[PDB]
Design a protein around this ligand. Sequence first.
Ligand code: CLA
Ligand code: CLA
Ligand code: CLA
Ligand code: CLA
Ligand code: CLA
Ligand SMILES: CC1=C(C#C/C(C)=C/C=C/C(C)=C/C=C/C=C(C)/C=C/C=C(\C)C#CC2=C(C)C[C@@H](O)CC2(C)C)C(C)(C)C[C@H](O)C1
Ligand SMILES: CC1=CCCC(C)(C)[C@H]1/C=C/C(C)=C/C=C/C(C)=C/C=C/C=C(C)/C=C/C=C(C)/C=C/C1=C(C)CCCC1(C)C
Ligand SMILES: CCCCCCCCCCCCO[C@H]1O[C@H](CO)[C@@H](O[C@H]2O[C@H](CO)[C@@H](O)[C@H](O)[C@H]2O)[C@H](O)[C@H]1O
Lengths: 30, 173, 659, 33, 180, 90, 143, 80
Amino acid sequence: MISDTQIFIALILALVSLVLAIRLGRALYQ
Amino acid sequence: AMSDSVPFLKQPEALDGSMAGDVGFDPLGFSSIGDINFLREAELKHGRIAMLAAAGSIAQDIFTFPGVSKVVGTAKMTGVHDILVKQGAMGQLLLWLSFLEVFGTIALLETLDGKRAPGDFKFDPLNFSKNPETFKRYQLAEIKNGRLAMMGVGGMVHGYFITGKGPLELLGN
Amino acid sequence: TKFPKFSQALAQDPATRRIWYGLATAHDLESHDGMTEENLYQKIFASHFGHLAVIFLWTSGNLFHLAWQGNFEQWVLNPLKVKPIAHAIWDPHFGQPAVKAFTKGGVSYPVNIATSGVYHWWYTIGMRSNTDLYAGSLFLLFLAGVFLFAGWLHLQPKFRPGLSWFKNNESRLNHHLSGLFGFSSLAWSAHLIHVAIPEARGQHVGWDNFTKVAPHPAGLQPFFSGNWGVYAAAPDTTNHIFGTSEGAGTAILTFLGGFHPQTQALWLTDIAHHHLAIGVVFIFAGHMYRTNWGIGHSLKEILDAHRPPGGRLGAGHKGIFETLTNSLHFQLGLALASLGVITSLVAQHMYALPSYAFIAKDYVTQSALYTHHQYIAGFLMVGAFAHGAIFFVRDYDPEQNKNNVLARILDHKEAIISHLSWVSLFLGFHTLGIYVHNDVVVAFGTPEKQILVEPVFAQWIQASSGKALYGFDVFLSSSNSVATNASSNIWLPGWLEAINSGKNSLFLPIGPGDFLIHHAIALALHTTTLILVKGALDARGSKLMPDKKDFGYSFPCDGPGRGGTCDISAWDAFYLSMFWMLNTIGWVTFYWHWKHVTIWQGNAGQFNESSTYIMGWLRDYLWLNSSPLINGYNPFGMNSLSVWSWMFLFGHLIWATGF
Amino acid sequence: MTAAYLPSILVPIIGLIFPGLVMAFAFIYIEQD
Amino acid sequence: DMSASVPFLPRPAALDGSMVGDVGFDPLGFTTKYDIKWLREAELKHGRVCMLASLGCIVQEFVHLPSEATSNPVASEAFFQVPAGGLWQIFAAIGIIEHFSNNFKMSGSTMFSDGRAPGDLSFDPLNFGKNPSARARYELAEIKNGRLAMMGFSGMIHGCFITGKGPLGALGSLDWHQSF
Amino acid sequence: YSPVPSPEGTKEVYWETKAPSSDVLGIGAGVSSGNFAASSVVALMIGGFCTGQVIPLTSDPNPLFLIGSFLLPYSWALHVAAWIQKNNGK
Amino acid sequence: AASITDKQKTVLAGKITVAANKVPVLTAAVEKMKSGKKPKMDRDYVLRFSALYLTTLVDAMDQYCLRDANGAKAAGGAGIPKVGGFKSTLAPSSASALYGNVDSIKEDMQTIRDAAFKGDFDGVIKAAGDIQTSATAFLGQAN
Amino acid sequence: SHSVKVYDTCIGCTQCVRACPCDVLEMVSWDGCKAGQIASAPRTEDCIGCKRCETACPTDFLSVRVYLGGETTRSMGLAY
Ligand code: CLA
Ligand code: CLA
Ligand code: CLA
Ligand code: CLA
Ligand code: CLA
Ligand SMILES: CC1=C(C#C/C(C)=C/C=C/C(C)=C/C=C/C=C(C)/C=C/C=C(\C)C#CC2=C(C)C[C@@H](O)CC2(C)C)C(C)(C)C[C@H](O)C1
Ligand SMILES: CC1=CCCC(C)(C)[C@H]1/C=C/C(C)=C/C=C/C(C)=C/C=C/C=C(C)/C=C/C=C(C)/C=C/C1=C(C)CCCC1(C)C
Ligand SMILES: CCCCCCCCCCCCO[C@H]1O[C@H](CO)[C@@H](O[C@H]2O[C@H](CO)[C@@H](O)[C@H](O)[C@H]2O)[C@H](O)[C@H]1O
């Protein structure tokens, strides 16, 4: 099954996607 | 203005006579469809590949390279192709000719813009086009031998299909 | 107040209307203050990147929540007995009996049982463990991040594309047809041949071994040899147990037709050859337009040249090229219409010809999938007509469209709307009359006097596909037909076995109730089309308001003068057609669910006898099947249906609040 | 469930702290001049 | 007019002969799409890494540091035999060298503002470069040896994959007699 | 609004006469109507023959007849081009 | 200080351990099938359990034996995994001494398959226990 | 504010000015109609948008036209 470390890795990837989404939202907002 | 080769037919509009071997032979009107430079580049490529193929069929009847006789046995002409597809000769040659034909694709793209003569790769290492009349004579000879080799390769391979012998094995009996 | 920074008029509003209208016009970029065409297209490009990232994140979330809290590894072993888990429940408002009643699926915590069918799809395409599910979720997170970065990058200076790039029709058509449609389908065929079919045959193929595990024992030698039919030899036996090597074949590309006898789904080799053929056809389609090398077609020349010389279409399609390229609303209407047609097609063809193993036995999943994609279809079609109306208001230039097909639509709009009105009244008068006639005559104890029309046209179509039920003996149901002899060596045995076995939803038997409900569906489609077409064609003006285009696509009214002008805008026609769209998808899904529920119960005669009058629908479908739903919680206890029992009432509440 | 603490940690945060901070900051943003 | 390396193709317009190693060989036209300075910096970095790599494969086939982890003559198997921590230290040292020698400008547009000549990292501790006539010949020899070592390392690593014998071992074990 | 781009060489082919101009035939703009009509007849015959050879389709169809079957829908466009060239004075 | 080959060995050992711990689920399932009011063998359940878990166990053991015999050329020193072309420069995976349990478990899988077609519950139970013992022997021998 | 336009089809009947509850319209001198007067809207900042003027207009399709625009305290009719 899935371990704690794998969930943490997925959370880190989601945080990277959050930062990129914030940057795209700021760029679209001019 | 009637065509010289076919006298009862009108001269083709896209054939000027400026090209080597132009006798005005186009009854079906193919030069009206394609660019004439593209058609001449295709004709030269088919003819040169057929010249090499005819010379190769004759030479592979004459002699074989060291070790080829165990790989291919007694399976001359097109019969070796499949065998050497199982071996690595055909793939290697296909790769290197594909490289050369990528650069030939760039050359054809430059031909289609009017900035390259058809079949002109400027490959004359041993200078033979030293005079503009020898150039025309060699152009006519190249196109004539290319057409002759096209039909000769057709004859050699289809006679091999019927007999299984080869171009010079057939003449041996 | 500077919340609606895109609208100075909204930002100076002193009331609570400012917040609402700033929320409601935020993505209407064409109406914003100082909007140029180039900035509009660049913002749309980045927004499309963001929506793509949202889709990838949602799919990664489904995969992750399944790999973490699901029972996929248990469900793979016993697919017809184990209930698939969507996600875990952690709700602190639960009491203990609700914790007990939601503890299902063989796990020790409260869960929701998945109805989306992602288990069957992921199992069919070769996923077996939770590890590859988690790896797919990580890959989709990375892909979403990549598309977010691309949306940011393609807004940065020296990367913002010009309007000439955005309006390059030929290059985008060639690349999206050959690569986005064709090569994607070819790559999916590659995934099915290389991964999905071996995992269906009990052989693990992953990234660690896919370069050394050949999809076929002969390798790519039959493909390079031209002996392609070797890939069709030795297909899966009818004794094949899915996911194991027992009874497995070696073929990778077949045209067997019909269903796998155990999974009750289409053969995976048939799906692989299908997606391979679709890829080849689409790559051939994607070399059609001229981009940089002289060969290829010009879209403007094709449009301008196709004017029929009899002059019945006027100037033909002249000016349609610029009108379509310059209008994003024309493009959006075409895209939404085509998407709505194809998601309706998805809904019909996926219940009729399921492709996922064991999903035809998951009745809840089939019902949810059909209902979901049909409601999506109704929404998409309403949107297509709405954005077409917006095109007529905002982007239609009459002087650029002289005697065009669009201009001639506008010139015989009265005939179009009047004939739609006639066909709607025709269908409604006589369909409702037959239903009420049947209701009255059954209520008076004489059901033999009912008007029951046999749907012989569609039954004839079923017989043409090979259904021997009706005895029509034509085309594939005739053993001597040229159509029968033509396909007899390729797909006719499997297709005939699948169509003539009453164990699936392949061309289900139909009677007078089916006749009546399709003519009711025809009524509802024609009436929704009437509202939407009348809204689009009167969007620029009517006799009551000849200057409507000066007022935009959406405005409240033109006041009580001239008799009163309530709901006169084209937006109001969208608003009226939304109710009719809800009504038609309601009728369609009611028909699908009642027919399938009576068939699955082994009681199809209940549908055959009760669907011919409305009281049968009210009593034997709505009232009869409401009993476990309304008993999800009661004064004696509760069970796992209670949430739906809540949501049901929830729906009945908020609908009424809309009133 | 592996990492069973994560629902009890994240569900109250996502359902009460995230909407409260979003509503507060959105209120400040839409009401400021 | 026409490129020197390929006579039948026109000379690329960006390659005017100011850059060393120029025989006008850009048949695919990458200079039209990408900046020439970035391409020359990439060419020199690929060539220098391959020069070190070719020298590395030749010397690691014959002589190694004494341990059983370092003892494999084949370079490809050596990458898997050695401890991974030292490989990570190699990666980190390469990263700090990349960040420092580029002066923390690593983007394509950002490297060439406050611009240094392509391939010049201001590294010349022995200072052979100071004479210009030697400098130009050194430039041409470095570009040609980098290209030749790119070809040589490609052949060496793919031959290590085929044979598993190492470069000189593969050259000595070329078989006149093969069956196919 | 902004100029709508077209591929290079795009001309105006809108027609209201009896037949379109020959430019709508693209690369076949210089082919006479007799050649088009003869090729249409030959394409119909070859396509029908090849199709009739492959109508009882098997799992090993002949590739040559499969290729030749595509000349039957080609012949329709050929006779349309024949009519166009015949009514264009060619 | 561990190489990439040692890391791949530990990953394979973890996979083998996970599948070996998965096997008693099948044991309990077959004991529940036997201890029923109408005892019938779910042949499909046993076949799918085998095709997932015993197959990944055998594959991971085979890869461990390949890394054991060859060493760094089996961890990637010979390049990507290949079928056909060139010549395999690798020793066969049978050359590892640890392959005997790999030979045992496989035949037991066939036993399980036969028992799944025969309805013999105790054959499945005994072969699953033998698979567990051979997995324990492999894991305690490989270290 | 709302925008009020008067088109040259106006016949100068003064009905729209008499119908206006907010004193937005007024009659000015003109030569285009027999009455010698045309409506005008100098005070559209007081326009609530009620369209009583359009209801009063007798010309086939209206000479006075109200286009609802940006809402203010006056145009929303807010006594607060
Ligand atoms: C067929 C026409 C043709 C001709 C006449 C030449 C001629 C030449 N090439 Mg060239 N080349 C060609 C095609 C051709 N090339 C093609 C198709 C490619 C691939 C795109 C290249 C790639 C290439 C590179 C990368 C280089 C040359 C170089 C050279 C020059 C060195 C001489 C030599 O033997 O090197 C030829 C070497 C090759 C690898 C090309 C082999 C291809 C065929 C066999 C051409 C044979 C050339 C011929 C023997 C030389 C004739 C000399 C002539 C002036 C008398 C010479 C001017 C070199 C040079 O001096 O440039 C600064 C160099 O660095 N060429
Ligand atoms: C375009 C450049 C190129 C070319 C022509 C080759 C050619 C070859 N490589 Mg190689 N390789 C390259 C780049 C290239 N490589 C790069 C950039 C890397 C990674 C840094 C590798 C890593 C690599 C490994 C690890 C192995 C090969 C192997 C091989 C041989 C068999 C093909 C194979 O297994 O797929 C190549 C496998 C890859 C992972 C490379 C994919 C990435 C490149 C960019 C694609 C190149 C595909 C190329 C067109 C295939 C040509 C062969 C084809 C005719 C069958 C063949 C001689 C195998 C070999 O020698 O067998 C004994 C082998 O085990 N290569
Ligand atoms: C509805 C479908 C449709 C239609 C009508 C067309 C129509 C056309 N396309 Mg198009 N195309 C399509 C779909 C379609 N295409 C699709 C789906 C794709 C891509 C997957 C393409 C890709 C495509 C490209 C890339 C190109 C075209 C081109 C053309 C034009 C060339 C006309 C031609 O072939 O004359 C040729 C004339 C003849 C074949 C006449 C025959 C000549 C003689 C008479 C032969 C017969 C001799 C004798 C009787 C037979 C015996 C011979 C024997 C002795 C050997 C034509 C307008 C070309 C063009 O001009 O672009 C505008 C072009 O470059 N198309
Ligand atoms: C059950 C509810 C219901 C019914 C029967 C109708 C019926 C109708 N709507 Mg409708 N509509 C409804 C709900 C309903 N709507 C709702 C909720 C909305 C959302 C606001 C709409 C929105 C809507 C729009 C936007 C449009 C319609 C249209 C239509 C008409 C064409 C469709 C049709 O079947 O024609 C057949 C007609 C009928 C079935 C009506 C019943 C006729 C009766 C049975 C005849 C008998 C009369 C009886 C003898 C009188 C005796 C009374 C006396 C004793 C006192 C029709 C009059 C369209 C239209 O006008 O098309 C021309 C149109 O444009 N409707
Ligand atoms: C997803 C969002 C969410 C979550 C996580 C909860 C969680 C909870 N709700 Mg619920 N609730 C929600 C949405 C949510 N609710 C909504 C939308 C409604 C409206 C229908 C309600 C209405 C509701 C009622 C009416 C009641 C609950 C109660 C409860 C508590 C369960 C009983 C218990 O053991 O409390 C034990 C409680 C405690 C030990 C006290 C906890 C105090 C917290 C930790 C202080 C947090 C302060 C604040 C959030 C700081 C941030 C401010 C910032 C956002 C500005 C639990 C804390 C019950 C309760 O006990 O309320 C306290 C209760 O009476 N809820
Ligand atoms: C340009 C380039 C040069 C290069 C060059 C190249 C190498 C030049 C060589 C071109 C060679 C390959 C010419 C080949 C011609 C083939 C002839 C036409 C055909 C015979 C076929 C017919 C008669 C027949 C057949 C027949 C039937 C069918 C079947 C058989 O039973 C009998 C038979 C065989 C009689 C060089 C390097 C020198 C230098 C220069 O600076 C640049
Ligand atoms: C209003 C608005 C203003 C302007 C913009 C706008 C968006 C353009 C417009 C809206 C337009 C609106 C949105 C239009 C929306 C339109 C509808 C949804 C288009 C549906 C078309 C069905 C086609 C013809 C396929 C038919 C199947 C036939 C060919 C099959 C036959 C056969 C097949 C081959 C196979 C076997 C079966 C048989 C039957 C034998
Ligand atoms: C020049 C005019 C004719 C040109 C015809 C070209 C045909 C297409 C060429 C196919 C690509 C090259 O093919 C060449 O390399 C392939 C590399 O995988 C070989 O393929 C071989 O290896 C594959 C990968 O392990 C196996 O799946 C194949 O069974 C095996 O045959 C082909 O046997 C060889 O012929």
